[model samples]
Target: VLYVGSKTKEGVVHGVATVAEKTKEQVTNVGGAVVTGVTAVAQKTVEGAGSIAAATGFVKKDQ
Candidate 1:
């Protein structure tokens, strides 16, 4: 009887661990998507600044 009870407890723990692992992967993916968006915005801002500087004669055009 004791052996059967221990086996059931172990099964429960295994199930819970599987669920936690899946949730962690989902959160990591969401964070990665957010990072990608922010990086794109940063790149565009730099490009815009360069364009404005060139329009105002602050920098010369590339040869």
Candidate 2:
């Protein structure tokens, strides 16, 4: 569970590592497929400065 909150620290995992792993694995469980759209919630500055460093984000619709 990637809880992108107001306290998203850089590389400093605030516990819940297992949950994050499980969530990632679950998303990867889906077979190869193409994504059409995406949805994002309303928020402000959930990402901290330097958070975008080395970040590669994409809605995984496939392997």
Candidate 3:
């Protein structure tokens, strides 16, 4: 009886570990995508501001 219980417990633990590993991978992927999108948007905003400043002669074109 003890042996059977031990085997069952190990199986449950293994299954939980497998699920946790997959969950971690998915979360990491989502986090990375969010960061990438945010960075792209921030860069575009900065570029747009610089372009407007240059057009208004507030900033030099060469700079």
Candidate 4:
């Protein structure tokens, strides 16, 4: 039947699109996580550098 065929086609197309979109979203999430991790590491590095500078008396104690 034409009606059944059309319905099946539409369902398959929708399912494929949904899968593709979900895959793309997952990739984006992974990329975002990597960026966040990198940013956290960079922040920690900065803090460590500040600590070392203070220990060496490079930073003013009063300030």
Candidate 5:
């Protein structure tokens, strides 16, 4: 059998990493490899969702 792979690349500000989580979960459920630690791009639709991106993704690691 064959498989599909994807990657993520974000700008300076970055976006939703939850997309990575859900995507990675799906990939894992499908028995595929999960490539994480790659940031995401900003979302126009998600911008008005009250910082779901910040809540899920950006947790301020070293601060």
Candidate 6:
């Protein structure tokens, strides 16, 4: 009974490991895309803020 229980536990662990390994690449790709999207949004927001400041005479042309 102990041997059987150990075998079952090992099999379950291996199955979980395999699933995690298989999805690792996909998770990394998705995570990178999310980071890139956030960066782009931040950049656009900064640009918009600069434009608003310039329009409101808060920022000058040269400076």
Q: Pick the candidate with the highest lDDT.
A: 5
Please tell me which predicted candidate would have the highest TM-score against the true structure: 5
lDDT of each: 0.29, 0.41, 0.29, 0.29, 0.42, 0.29
Candidate 2 clashing pairs?
none
Measured against the true structure, the TM-scores of the candidates, in listed sequence, are: 0.10, 0.16, 0.10, 0.10, 0.18, 0.10
Candidate 5 lDDT by residue in tens digits, 1-63: 444444544323634345323433433435333454545434444345533233334446795
Worst 10 residues of 4 by lDDT: 34-43
TM-score: model 3 vs. ground truth: 0.10
Between prediction 3 and prediction 5, which has the larger TM-score?
A: 5
lDDT of 1: 0.29
Q: Give, for candidate 1, the lowest lDDT window spanning 10 residues.
A: 34-43
lDDT by residue for model 6 over 1-63, one digit each (tens)?
456536332212122222223433433542212322111111233334423122323344683
Collision pairs in model 6: none
Clashing pairs in 1: none
State in Å the error of residue 39, model 3: 12
For model 3, what is the C-alpha lDDT against the true structure?
0.29
Question: How high is the lDDT of residue 49 in model 6?
Answer: 43
Residue-level lDDT of model 4, residues 1-63, one tens digit each, is 456536332212122222223333333542212322111121233334433122323355784
Deviation from native of the Cα of residue 2 in model 3, angstroms: 88
